[PDB]
Design an enzyme around this catalytic site. Structure first.
Site, short mmCIF file in Angstrom:
data_model
loop_
_atom_site.label_atom_id
_atom_site.label_comp_id
_atom_site.label_asym_id
_atom_site.label_seq_id
_atom_site.Cartn_x
_atom_site.Cartn_y
_atom_site.Cartn_z
CB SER A 31 -1.02 0.02 1.10
OG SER A 31 -1.97 -1.04 0.99
CE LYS A 67 -1.44 4.22 2.21
NZ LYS A 67 -1.47 3.03 3.07
CB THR A 68 0.97 1.65 6.91
OG1 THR A 68 -0.43 1.68 6.64
CG2 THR A 68 1.31 2.34 8.22
N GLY A 69 1.94 0.02 4.63
CA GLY A 69 1.79 -1.09 3.71
C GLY A 69 1.83 -2.40 4.49
B1 LIG Z 1 -2.08 -2.06 2.02
O1 LIG Z 1 -0.82 -2.42 1.74
O2 LIG Z 1 -2.46 -1.17 3.02
C1 LIG Z 1 -3.49 -1.78 3.82
C2 LIG Z 1 -4.09 -2.82 2.92
C3 LIG Z 1 -5.25 -3.56 3.12
C4 LIG Z 1 -5.55 -4.48 2.14
F1 LIG Z 1 -6.67 -5.23 2.31
C5 LIG Z 1 -4.80 -4.67 0.99
C6 LIG Z 1 -3.65 -3.93 0.80
C7 LIG Z 1 -3.30 -2.97 1.76
#
Ligand SMILES: *[B@@]1([O])O[C]C2=[C]C(F)=[C][C]=C21
Ligand SMILES: [Cl-]
Length: 260
Positions: A42, A206-208
């Site tokens: 993400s 921003k997370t991932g």
């Molecule tokens: B992502 O990398 O940030 C949160 C998220 C949830 C998801 F269901 C898929 C991908 C992402």
């Protein structure tokens, strides 16, 4: 010492760790596996919003474009676009949602408005980022398969970009500000970089997450004393159903901030 602790943290955590830090104070950098690739997950949403912001430099009305998305666009993970199915969303709200809630439909919608995957690549290239590489749409891009180059960057490339974009002169000022602002209102960050940072500081992030317990976070941190700091932490593990290691991101942050 700086290096030894991360290497030790990473040994202990049983994963591969990618850090890049830029103190825009002096201009100094802490790099660990900074040139290796990692699955961004993400985290690319950040780059995507920057692209949208870049394009709106031409199109005064882009941010305010009303988008009427359909039933079929909706994905498993889309709280915000779900909430507004019926009224639609502005491109600008789409950006807030993608950043602040990590909404997948919003992202797909925004890639489509830019005109496809390659438009995110081209924006990345035009800012000096030669490593960023988006290969699939959501949700397929968070598989994080071992030594799969699809949908990866290097910590260094992402730090440089976040630096140029949020603190540098990549963008005009209103677009620059908007980007920091979205970041500041992120709701998925409490447990990662935020958690390793003085509670008086202001953090935009921003997370991932994804498979192979991929845990990522990319941040600007506004300290009490001094200039903003850019921090990128990526992490990945042995097994595909590995659980995330947010703590590892918290601990990395704790380490990097002692050095400063
Ligand atoms: B992502 O990398 O940030 C949160 C998220 C949830 C998801 F269901 C898929 C991908 C992402
Ligand atoms: Cl500004």
């Amino acid at each position: 010492s700086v290096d030894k602790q991360l290497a030790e943290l990473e040994r202990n955590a049983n994963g591969r760790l990618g850090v890049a830090m830029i103190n825009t104070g002096n201009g100094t950098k802490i790099l660990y596996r900074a040139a290796q690739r990692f699955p961004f997950c993400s985290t690319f949403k950040f780059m995507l919003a920057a692209a949208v912001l870049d394009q709106s430099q031409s199109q005064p009305n882009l941010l305010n474009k009303h988008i009427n998305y359909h039933e079929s666009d909706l994905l498993s993970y889309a709280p915000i676009t779900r909430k507004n199915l019926a009224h639609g969303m502005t491109v600008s709200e789409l950006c807030a949602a993608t950043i602040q809630y990590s909404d997948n439909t919003a992202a797909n919608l925004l890639i489509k408005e830019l005109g496809g995957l390659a438009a995110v690549n081209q924006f990345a290239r035009s800012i000096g980022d030669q490593m960023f590489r988006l290969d699939r749409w959501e949700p397929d891009l968070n598989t994080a398969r071992p030594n799969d180059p699809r949908d990866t960057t290097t910590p260094a490339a992402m730090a440089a970009s976040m630096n140029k974009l949020v603190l540098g002169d990549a963008l005009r000022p209103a677009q620059r500000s908007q980007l920091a602002v979205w970041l500041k209102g992120n709701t998925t960050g409490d447990a990662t970089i935020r958690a390793g940072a003085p509670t008086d500081w202001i953090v935009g992030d921003k997370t991932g997450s994804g498979d192979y317990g991929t845990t990522n976070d990319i941040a600007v941190l506004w300290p009490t004393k001094g200039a903003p700091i850019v921090l990128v932490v990526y992490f990945t593990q042995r097994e595909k159903d590995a659980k995330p290691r947010r703590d590892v991101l918290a601990s990395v942050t704790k380490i990097i901030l002692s050095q400063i």
